[PDB]
Structure 1
Amino acid sequence: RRLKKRIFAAVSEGCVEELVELLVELQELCRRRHDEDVPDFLMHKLTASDTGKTCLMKALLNINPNTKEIVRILLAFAEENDILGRFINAEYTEEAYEGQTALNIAIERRQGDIAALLIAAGADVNAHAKGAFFNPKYQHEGFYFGETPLALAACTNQPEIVQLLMEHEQTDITSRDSRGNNILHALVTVAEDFKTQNDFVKRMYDMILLRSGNWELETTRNNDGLTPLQLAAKMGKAEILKYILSREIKEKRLRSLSRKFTDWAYGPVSSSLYDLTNVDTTTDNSVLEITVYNTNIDNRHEMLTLEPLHTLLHMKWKKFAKHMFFLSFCFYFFYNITLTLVSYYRPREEEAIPHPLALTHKMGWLQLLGRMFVLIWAMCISVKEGIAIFLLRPSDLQSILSDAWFHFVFFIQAVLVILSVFLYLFAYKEYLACLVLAMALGWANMLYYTRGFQSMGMYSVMIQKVILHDVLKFLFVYIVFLLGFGVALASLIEKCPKDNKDCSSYGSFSDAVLELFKLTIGLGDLNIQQNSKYPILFLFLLITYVILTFVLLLNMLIALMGETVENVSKESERIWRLQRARTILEFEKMLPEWLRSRFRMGELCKVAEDDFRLCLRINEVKWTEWKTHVSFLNEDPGPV
């Protein structure tokens, strides 16, 4: 009734003196019952019935200059009625706000003095706002921060309240929400670039990790099964992934929380050790494996540039991946030549033409070793690519269809060699037709091996960029200039049946269009221009057609120089290095179990008491900063 609406309104604008007698009028009504209904009846008149919003929640949503004194009055009234516990720990009954308390409101409204007063009054510091607004569906239906008051102060850049909550000892730092995330998973999710936000989410990662002092937070996996190190590789958060992967803590007793260790130093020359626990490809999910195969992010070049991810990807190339790439080139370059030698290097008169790869006797060991090599190598590709694209982990949802289109063209070329043999044994007339497309696609797939060199690799990316994206711009304007002069010149051409002795034309329109193809490619003649209706008028449309064609060819060069001639060379250099980075990790899966252990990187380094980690050494010479060295593992400098 009227008593309820006046209390909700008095805490909105800031009428402090009006709220006094309204709480007295609520207190004068208490002396008509006993103690079973009096704590119950005050919950009906201080809260709502459809949402669950209290008088304390209404005052904190409306920030007024009397917001400090108005909280002290309402909490003192709950102490006198001994209902303070259920008042400050109330929650919304609304589906889009389920779990939100009065402590979550005061943190977001930048009220550090009120939020310090609520915790001392007995507010729950482990409230889980599981509502639909705080856990959105895809994007921007709300704001996901971590569903805890510790994460709300951390994600909204409030370092004074984060230090206040960690000192309070009902605060469970290792809490896990409905998504399985903890305080360190949620900082990776809300993180952005330095241009976008600041470097403050990196500093909030530092403050919370040092207060815990354990390896429990970075080891716990969420409901998806990822660590906070692996969310930075999955979501593409490069600045957080740079900090965790090169974290060097100088201050003692927290030295074992480091992933970067200095072994020795002597003046400007120093030696570092990078931790490779979940980074090197020896486990199921590693940082190097997630970063390369992530077709959902657009910053893989910024993440693989980082110092251990750069070095591990470079040391795998020098040991085995360059040798396997050249060996794959040698068996495939010999494969394309042998297809040509069995198909065109046989002069026979007719002899009812034998199809190639047909194993007969009385032939010789030169041709026997040749056709046996082609038959096996066509099946070794077709089985292996039959594993890749198909049933045994098909992976063709969006993974192969985004950055791995070479898996299909090696598979199609391998089938058409085998399928053309099957059509010849079944006595069909398509044995030669399938063999020509097999040989034409075989020499076309030699562009896969251009990625062994940088200059050869960057040049082949520019060819794939023009054909797949920029040729249909040229063609669709070329045909409307083709058919524009095509219907014009067809009325000028005198009809072919004048003599019908060598007349094999395809129509009046077909004669005009085919001559414009030949005049563009440089194979044009003047036999029709002489035998025309208007010979001078037939020539001027051909001169105009060359000028329009040259304008089309001249604006293709300006379009390929779009807004910078360097950024075209940048985009062909960044996506080339991802083609090598995929090629290195696919060669590592080809190796057996005993051979992967031989080419394994790392060495056992005693970084602490009973702490042996497979670390990788990277040396560095730094002349700018001059400091005395107190953080080191070995006091004797030198690779001994």
Structure 2
Amino acid sequence: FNPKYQHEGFYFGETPLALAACTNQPEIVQLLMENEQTDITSQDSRGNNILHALVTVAEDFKTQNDFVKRMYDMILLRSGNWELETMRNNDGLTPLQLAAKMGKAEILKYILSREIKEKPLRSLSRKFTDWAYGPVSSSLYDLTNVDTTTDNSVLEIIVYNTNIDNRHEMLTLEPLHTLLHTKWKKFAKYMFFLSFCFYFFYNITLTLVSYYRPREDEDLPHPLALTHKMSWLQLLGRMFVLIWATCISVKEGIAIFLLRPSDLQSILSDAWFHFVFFVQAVLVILSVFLYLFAYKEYLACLVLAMALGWANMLYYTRGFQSMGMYSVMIQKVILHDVLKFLFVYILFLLGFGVALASLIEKCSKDKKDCSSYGSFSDAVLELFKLTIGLGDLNIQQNSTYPILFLFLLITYVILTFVLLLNMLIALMGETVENVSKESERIWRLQRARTILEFEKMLPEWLRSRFRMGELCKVADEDFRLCLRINEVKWTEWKTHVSFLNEDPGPIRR
């Protein structure tokens, strides 16, 4: 049980009952289940039962005969109660949590349904059929450790966890998918729009107070203006902007105090927004120290937060159907695809730039070379104006070949206008069609980054219900474990035995 599984790595749960099932040996498991001396409850050095370590090895569907799902089914349906399943090991978590925290995709599909067709042990299922009335069934998942109503559930640990490459497929599963669709539907659509309404109106009032013709003098006017002047609306901005810079800094200043995976593998989900929201809030309130003794960077530092206050405005695009899909087809690109450009384009920028500067730099090159500014870096700045359509052409010589030098400029032109510009186009011919038909899943994660954030932002009594409370699964006494309703569809009919009600669709009466 050493990590880095090259170092041998065979944490099967260190009991003879466990590797019976872990090695896909079905007859020897039933051989062990007949002995009265056989224990299942007994834990490990990590505190694990047979169910924990059976979760820890599935890894796949390809490199698995789909037996780990069977051995899970064999070990509960032969014997067990809910005390065998709700056991926590050394780390404090349900074995349902561990399928999410380790990131096992295939086995967590089975834990959420686990339908029981037989009669004596239908209590331990996680899925029920209310009524059939033909090919239109109504779904009902158990939802007792799944939604964020307790501490450290599966939905909180499936969103706030790095180190799993398989998250965007996980939320497709049915007790997670429609529930997260429902919780966004009834209030988090509205709580997201007002967060954009309070923030897009924030960036305007930042911009408007810089353009109430606010100079009129040498340079006095800070847009504070709580001191002398006559009328209204010069005061409504600062009671708005300074407070909405204050609260946005405190909220992000504590939301940064959760994340240990700061930048390793944190490409875009958590790094580039909670950092940039905090930096933009700092630079606005930094102007208070700039108004203290009129430090000369009072405005140049201030205006940098303005554009970066409009730059991080792109974050609220996540939440419109395909607009955020465009927002992730750029945010996967703007880090490591201009990196393949800029670590090549600069390598030809200064590359050909040294040859074109020294060839013409001897004498009175252009416009009275006695006082006018111009150097090596001038030919570098003229080189980028050659790329974009500015393209001035005043150019001279001393003792080298003029039109041959103008032809040597064309050597730089044939790269990065037909070649290095367009290999990036050829790079996007394969990368984005890999992101397309897959951005739909990974943007859905970025939706889930916000939905649980609004759950943590509101510690009220939660009048918004999002479940159906105290609905009975099956017992004579146990009428508990609040529930969920969905709908199903057509063929493979069968005689539906286990119902729960006298075929209604809605509530009776």
Deviation at 1:217?
1.5
User: Are residues 247 and 503 of structure 1, via their aligned partners in 2, closer, same or farther at CA, if it must alter by over 3 Å?
Assistant: farther
CA deviation after TM superposition for structure 1 residue 349, in Å:
3.1
CA distance in structure 1 between the aligned counterparts of 2:201 and 2:24, rounded to whole angstroms = 62
- The alpha-carbon deviation at position 504 of structure 1 amounts to 5.4
Q: 1:448 to 1:496 in 2, by over 3 A?
A: farther
- Which residue is equivalent to 2:244? 377
Q: Tell me how far 1:443 sits from its aligned partner.
A: 0.6
Relative to 1, partners in 2 of residues 1:615 and 1:562: Cα closer, same or farther, differing over 3 Å? farther
Q: C-alpha distance in 2, partners of 1:500/1:395?
A: 53
CA distance in 1, matches of 2:399, 2:333: 39
The answer to whether the 8 A contact 1:588-1:596 is kept is no
Whether 2:461 is the aligned partner of 1:577: answer no
Q: CA deviation at 1:561?
A: 3.2
Q: 1:526 to 1:510 in 2, by over 3 A?
A: same
What does residue 621 of structure 1 align with? Answer: 488
CA distance 1:364–1:297, shift in 2 (3 Å): same
Q: Which runs of 5+ in 2 are unaligned?
A: none
Matched, 1:336 2:217: no
Q: Deviations over 1:226-278 (max 9, x none)?
A: 22111101011111111011111010110101110111111111112110100
TM superposition shift of 1:209? 0.5
Which deviates the most, 487-496 or 399-408?
399-408
Matched residue SS, 1:605:
coil
1:401, distance to aligned residue in structure 2 (A): 8.6
Structure 1 pair 353–482 and aligned structure 2 pair: CA distance change class (3 A): same
Q: Within 5 Å, give how 1:505-516 maps onto structure 2.
A: 506-516=373-383
Task: Give the whole-Å Cα distance in 2 for the aligned partners of 1:240 and 1:194.
Answer: 10
* Structure 1 position 140, deviation (Å): 3.8
- Paired residue secondary structure (1:333): helix
Question: 1:500 Cα shift?
Answer: 6.9
> Is the counterpart of residue 422 in structure 1 residue 289 in structure 2?
yes
Secondary structure of 1:518's counterpart equals helix
CA contact (8 A) 1:276 1:613 kept: no
CA distance 1:566–1:618, change in 2 (3 Å): farther
**Native 8 Å contact 1:191 1:240 kept in 2:** yes
Instruction: Report the CA distance between 1:593 and its aligned residue.
Output: 2.0
Cα 1:179–1:350 change in 2 (3 A) is same
Residue 300 of structure 1, CA deviation = 0.8
Residues 325 and 256 of structure 1: CA distance in aligned 2, closer, same or farther (over 3 Å): same
**1-structure distance, mates of 2:196, 2:294:** 35
Q: 1:600 to 1:367 in 2, by over 3 A?
A: farther
Alpha-carbon spacing, 1:286–1:149, altered in 2? closer, same or farther (3 Å) = same
- d(CA) in 1 for partners of 2:263, 2:365: 60
Instruction: Write the distance in 1 (CA, Å) between the matches of 2:263 and 2:432.
Output: 35
TM-score computed with the length of structure 1 as normaliser: 0.74
**Which has the higher relative contact order, 1 or 2, with Cα contacts under 8 A spaced 6 or more apart?**
2
Q: CA deviation at 1:509?
A: 2.3
Residues 80-122 of structure 1: per-residue CA shift (max 9 Å, x gap) = xxxxxxxxxxxxxxxxxxxxxxxxxxxxxxxxxxxxxxxxxxx
What are the Cα deviations for residues 58-101 of structure 1, in whole angstroms up to 9, with x where unaligned? Answer: xxxxxxxxxxxxxxxxxxxxxxxxxxxxxxxxxxxxxxxxxxxx
Aligned equivalents of 1:391, 1:262: Cα separation in 2 = 41
1:254 aligns with 2:121: yes
Describe the SS at the equivalent of 2:334: helix
Structure 2 Cα separation of the partners of residues 608 and 375 of structure 1: 58
Task: Tell me the distance in 2 between the aligned counterparts of 1:400 and 1:181.
Answer: 34
> Over residues 496-546 of structure 1, what are the superposed CA-to-partner deviations in whole Å (9 max), with x where a residue is unaligned?
646875765555422322211110011121111588853311221222222
TM-aligned CA deviation for residue 216 of structure 1: 1.3
Give the Cα–Cα distance (whole angstroms) in 1 for the partners of residues 461 and 262 of structure 2: 27
Q: Which has the larger radius of gyration?
A: 1
Deviation at 1:616, TM superposition (A): 3.8
Q: Are 1:235 and 1:297, in contact at CA under 8 Å, matched by a contact in 2? A: yes
SS at 2:130 equivalent: strand
Distance in 2 separating the partners of 1:442 and 1:552: 35
More off after superposition, 597-606 vs 262-271:
597-606
Of 375-384 and 595-604, more deviation after overlay is shown by 595-604
% identical aligned pairs: 96
Do the aligned partners of residues 601 and 302 (structure 1) sit closer, same or farther apart at CA in structure 2, a change above 3 Å counting?
farther
C-alpha deviation, 1:358, in angstroms: 4.2
Note if contact 2:100-2:108 (Cα within 8 Å) is conserved in structure 1.
yes
Relative to structure 1, the CA distance from residue 341 to residue 601 in structure 2 (aligned partners, 3 Å threshold; closer, same or farther) is farther
1:494 Cα deviation from its structure 2 partner: 5.2
Kindly indicate whether the alpha-carbon contact (under 8 Å) linking 2:245 and 2:284 is maintained by their aligned counterparts in 1.
yes
1:393 counterpart residue number: 260
Give the Å deviation of 1:483.
Answer: 2.8
**Structure-1 separation of matches of 2:260 and 2:331:** 28
1:254 and 1:323 map into 2 onto residues whose CA distance is 43
Paired residue secondary structure (1:538) = helix
Q: 1:532 to 1:597 in 2, by over 3 A?
A: farther
**CA distance 1:633–1:148, change in 2 (3 Å):** same
Tell me by how many angstroms 1:160 deviates. 0.6
Greater percentage in helix: 1
CA distance in 1, matches of 2:132, 2:350: 75
- Counterpart of 2:318 in 1: which secondary structure? helix
Given that 1:387 and 1:394 are in contact with CA atoms closer than 8 Å, whether structure 2 keeps it comes out as: no
Distance 1:455 1:530, change over 3 A: farther
Shifted more, 553-562 versus 509-518: the winner is 553-562
Residues 331 and 574 (structure 1), Cα distance of their counterparts in 2 relative to 1, 3 Å cut = same
On the 8 A contact 2:357/2:379 being kept in 1, the answer is yes
> CA 1:387–1:264 in 2, change beyond 3 Å: closer, same or farther?
same
| Residues 413 and 441, structure 1, Cα contact 8 Å, conserved in 2 | yes
Work out the CA distance in 2 between the residues paired with 1:267 and 1:453: 37
SS at match of 2:239: helix
8 Å contact 1:342–1:356 — kept in the other structure?
Answer: yes
- 1:470-514 deviation line (CA, Å, top 9, x unaligned): 112112222232233222222332556468757655554223222
Shift of 1:308: 0.9
Deviations along 1:20-65, whole A, 9 cap, x unmatched? Answer: xxxxxxxxxxxxxxxxxxxxxxxxxxxxxxxxxxxxxxxxxxxxxx
Q: 1:466 to 1:619 in 2, by over 3 A?
A: closer
Q: Which moved more, 1:134-143 or 1:408-417?
A: 134-143
The two structures have a TM-score, normalised by structure 2, of 0.92
CA contact (8 A) 1:495 1:508 kept: no
Tell me by how many angstroms 1:608 deviates.
2.4
Deviation of 1:563 after TM superposition, in Å, equals 4.3
- Within 2, Cα distance between the matches of 1:374 and 1:391? 27
Unaligned runs of 5+ in 1: 1-133
Shift of 1:459: 1.1
Deviation at 1:620, TM superposition (A): 3.0
Q: In the alignment, is the contact (CA less than 8 A) between 1:221 and 1:227 conserved in 2?
A: yes
Separation in 2 of the partners of 1:549 and 1:400? Answer: 28
The secondary structure found in structure 1 opposite 2:468 is coil
Tell me how far 1:190 sits from its aligned partner: 1.4
Whether contact under 8 Å (2:58, 2:107) holds in the other structure is yes
Q: Secondary structure at the match of 1:236?
A: coil
Match of 2:98 among 231, 249, 254: 231
Choose from 329, 336, 350 the match for 1:462. 329
Change (3 A) 1:592 1:542: same
Three-state SS of the structure 2 residue aligned to 1:540 is helix
* C-alpha displacement of 1:362: 2.7
CA contact (8 A) 1:184 1:205 kept: yes
Distance of 2:264 and 2:338 partners within structure 1: 27
CA 1:203–1:572 in 2, change beyond 3 Å: closer, same or farther?
same
Determine if the alignment matches structure 1 residue 326 to structure 2 residue 186: no
Q: Which stretch shows the higher mean deviation, 366-375 or 348-357?
A: 348-357
Moved more, 158-167 or 212-221: 212-221
Aligned position for 1:446: 313
Partner SS, residue 586 of structure 1: helix
Q: Which stretch of structure 1 is more off in the superposition, 585-594 or 620-629?
A: 620-629
